[model samples]
Target: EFLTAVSSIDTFLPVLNEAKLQWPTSALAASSEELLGGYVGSQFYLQDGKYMQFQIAGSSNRCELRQMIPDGGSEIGWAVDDGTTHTATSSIVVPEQVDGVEEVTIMQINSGEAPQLRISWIRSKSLDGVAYEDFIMSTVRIGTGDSSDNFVKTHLADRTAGAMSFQIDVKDSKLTITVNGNVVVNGQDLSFWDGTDSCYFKAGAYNNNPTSESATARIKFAALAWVDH
Candidate 1:
């Protein structure tokens, strides 16, 4: 009830501003900070106005900051230049596990293509920073939206409270993933993202926490760029 629901790149503050309401006492203004051209930015604060936290105790509820024209809205592709390239970079202090799933979605290239890139994490499942049960796989996945080939995961050092860096790049017909400048998955052969799909950048606690159990996180961004070249 406390965590303000903000999802706009143009509006200065997306939270409710009602000193009488007691929840979002004062709206957030981080989105006012000028970000790069192709980049949009935001910050979630659990310490605010009346209601001071994020509670998501539902079956499949989510608390995310996504970049896309709303459902059934305008369909726009990345700036095209022969073959466009997309890269999403950010540095955030990862939080600890709560109840349901939590992840920092660095990039999501979704479409009918069975193998759209879905680089994310399964928080409650990983141990030792970024290391998980799979030796050859990682938490940051390259998904295919099918049975097992739907996604591929990898490991990065457990970065709780640590400023963890992330990078996901796609160009031509190949993709590369990096953590703190170290290559996790590089030059992986893939097809050029068909410009007809919904391609965008998203981040933050994309979680399934219950409304009964409150969840809070402060996601800092070192860089949030959506380059087209």
Candidate 2:
């Protein structure tokens, strides 16, 4: 069939429309909440000539980016989380750690015995209990010795509103993490990579056997994620 074309017909916020008639401006920020009348995953332009777009069908597991100008999807997204379809896990593909997100600090499970804090590599999980003190032997930053009395456990489980969010970049993959209102121990790449770039937060203690229950961690985990290589 036939369709009429409307070049540059996208509307801007009331405040930014002013200079369009006077000069060419670029780079702008819009709070998603303010754009209630707007669409969430449509191609929109910033003042700096850059464009923003998303796939209409995205789950917390992964979001597909689009370049409508030429109609394209991401050729090389950093492989954020490689979760397959139809499996339910404590992971969800969170938003990327862009410059504009609001980040908050939260207190996660204490890492005594072998305390480990789990990070959501994806967005679907509220808590999976994978990063328990008994499981983690590697981590980036940590506090408290494996004492449950010293730290707080994760509050939310999945995309339960009020989750703290942030992003970190591996060699290529970038992700926005929603850490349960807990203090994030800043470390570097700490994942056992067999194929994908996977990492998690860990804090282990002295004396413990992987099979022996006595070697159990004094702490426990609430949730975590794995990457899709």
Candidate 3:
């Protein structure tokens, strides 16, 4: 089963409708297909074989799966000071995206109060006056809190309209990201996460720029897995 690849972790699908104000949530169980209205659904597509598709409009809120504590447990973060390790591995394809959009977060780590780390696809103009797209990995800087000034970002790779593999690991107050089997972000220490907050993983389409109502972001996942050990 598709959810079995992810160790059957409990998840909740939060979907934002066209109005940009409503958040309809769906509890996802261990199944091959689940639908949260028309905004989000899981099914096989003929265009690219079979995959779990997440689609969201630019003007809407978001369509993402929030990882929860398994087996009806309380919401808790994997402690950074503890020896436990949390990992999320996935194979995804960005077959569609909105033009002129500044950023779209595909994956992130969310604490109780704020987001700690973000993996985004960015579209910007270079000094040569040419527009380009690329993937970026960012984290919150220590002591300053989660703000524009307290964030540090690194370029991972150029964005190609193809399938990409990712492995994100958080352990011992450090973060590591691997893309297509290449280590992009190596064991970066996260001192800010120590003692104060823990974190969980969130994935799918989160359109940061809700500029156009007609534009949309489409993502396909061939495989998704998570582990906490």
Candidate 4:
């Protein structure tokens, strides 16, 4: 056996506010950020091929998810682009159920504008700072939705962030998540998604252990919701 396999990412931090500030003009804010027109930007996936950007007009009618990703080979970003401008119900949610029929759902709630947040599954490792188990095959989102409690992301795909695009495979499995475009999963199960089926959601299941040394990985969030436009 091994000396230590490390604790799960589900028991790392409490209300872990993982965010960084970067300038939009910085090299990091190039690709998708450019598509966002102006204003500061963040790294969030859009579900619809049409909805490339999450925008919110002059209004406080909804909530948004803020993204904080790393910029490699890219320039330095000053601040994160919270999905507040994406005017509408916006959120990326998942479910988790160990026993039952396979029917998990990855949801987004937008009120009147575009997505204001990006949905993702985050866990930290000892060597690795904080890795995102993003689905390569499936795309992510930034929309409108009230993140009152928490959502479960059942049937995870298990992919690390490296490639350019996400690639999530679909089939008869535990769960399925297809966001911006394809799936974003790696390893044994890379086809994780969520829908109305309602069986395997666990985004808002349990918080991480506060006093445990095995507090490296836990579920951070893109908690959001939309308001009346």
Candidate 5:
């Protein structure tokens, strides 16, 4: 199922050194043998049970797969009000958890202008300074200035460890997010996207903080798929 799901999309891994320098382009293959031997860097590899693990250290870059638009076209993404529905679903687990980590984005809607939606695991500290992890959804309007007011966030899930299922749906300029079959974000408007930029999906571990090399974010994905319905 994992291979089948990944086979439906064109996925690429953007390799970058610790200094954030780009490497040669590499792609994830649908064949198991190719995937086992291809681009399995220190940051990404296949774990037991065929789960794909993506790990990134602080100050280091990400080890995520960016779903490419078919035909290498930039303007192929659907418009917000086009009445088309795009859905991305995944089964993931956080094998290793750390404390005081600011953010680790696991999924995203990457647009030409900016990230339309970011599904992340965030650490929140209680009064006792104990950190707890939770999933959060955030969005930035296209072409807008990077101001706090230009972003909106909603809570998506509570627990951080163990296996969890996520489903993101975008239809008719509205967004819906479901975790473990429960809808957390429903019918949220996304008309701010002006459709001038194309969009694509991305999955894996993307640590937002690039200052701490000691902190590590490790995530495993059992399955992932993108479907247009």
Candidate 6:
């Protein structure tokens, strides 16, 4: 959980196993084969420790930090989480700019379906199609279907800089989120997901458009942890 590193496949690759986290090479095709891994130091580290860094250069790239529970279920996956109190937290730093369709999906608690929930720091064009051509916006998106109409998004931070911490707590059919120690966003409906099996937690930079532009999505995670309360 504390350390240092330097490469895409070498420096932090060993830490994936060393820290008991899985690094999947099976879905390389989905990410368009860009660099997604761990490292240490950057202007965004914010704190004095090693961090997980996700970057996408050129078009079509994604790098994720994930931990899947044995119950593997996405939205409508014929299964759901164990209907228990769940909480996940992470520290992040958004240091670069997003262009065209470029974006940085910082955090997500997904049921692997249409109605998944996510905390995103985005730029320009978003899947939800917010009418902003410049500046980055920190927002929470409640996805219900495939179109912009299905995306119920709430703007959180108009402009965020330096380091920030976030957490998602799911309990008693309520979903809440806190940013840098303040309650910023939440929803009254946790009914979209009927806990029948299990879901997963995903964090990192996710690019929706592949032909957009060549830019790096730089963000640092000082730490990420999940617990079932």
On lDDT, the candidate that comes out on top is 5
Model 2 segments more than 4 A misplaced: 1-55, 58-63, 66-165, 171-190, 194-229
Q: Which of the two candidates, 5 or 6, achieves a greater lDDT against the reference?
A: 5
For each candidate, the alpha-carbon lDDT, in order, equals: 0.41, 0.23, 0.59, 0.24, 0.61, 0.52
The residue-by-residue lDDT of candidate 4 on 1-229, one tens digit each, is 2221111122211111221112121123223233232222222223222121222111121112222222212221121122112121222323222222122112222112332122333232221243433331122232124452222233234433321222222233222334334443322221122221221111211222223322222211333221211
lDDT of model 5 at position 183: 91
RMSD (Cα, Å) for all candidates, in order, is: 8.9, 18.9, 7.0, 18.2, 6.9, 7.0
Best candidate (score: TM-score) = 5
91: Cα error in model 3, Å: 1.0
Collision count of model 4: 91
Clashes of 1: 14
Question: In candidate 5, what are the lDDT values of residues 121-155, reduced to their tens digit?
Answer: 76652322544445554444534677666676666
Q: Mind sharing the TM-score for model 2?
A: 0.21
Ranking the candidates on lDDT from highest down gives 5, 3, 6, 1, 4, 2
Q: Model 6 over residues 1-229: C-alpha lDDT tens digits?
A: 5444433333333223312221222152211111224333331122333556665544435565454432332112222335667777877667656555455666766554432566766655443455653233333334445655545566655445666778877776667777778776664455556653445566666655534566566667766666665
Model 5's TM-score against the true structure: 0.73
Model 1 score (lDDT): 0.41
What order do you get sorting by TM-score, best first? 5, 3, 6, 1, 2, 4
User: Which 10 consecutive residues of model 3 have the lowest summed lDDT?
Assistant: 15-24
Model 4, runs deviating above 4 Å: 1-37, 41-107, 110-118, 124-152, 164-176, 179-229
Name model 1 segments beyond 4 Å from true. Answer: 1-43, 46-59, 68-75, 79-82, 100-107, 111-115, 124-145, 192-196, 208-223
Candidate 3 Cα outliers beyond 4 Å, as residue runs: 1-49, 72-76, 125-132, 139-149
Runs in model 6 lying further than 4 Å from the true structure: 1-49, 58-60, 70-81, 98-101, 125-144, 210-213
Structural RMSD, model 5: 6.9
RMSD over all Cα atoms, model 6: 7.0
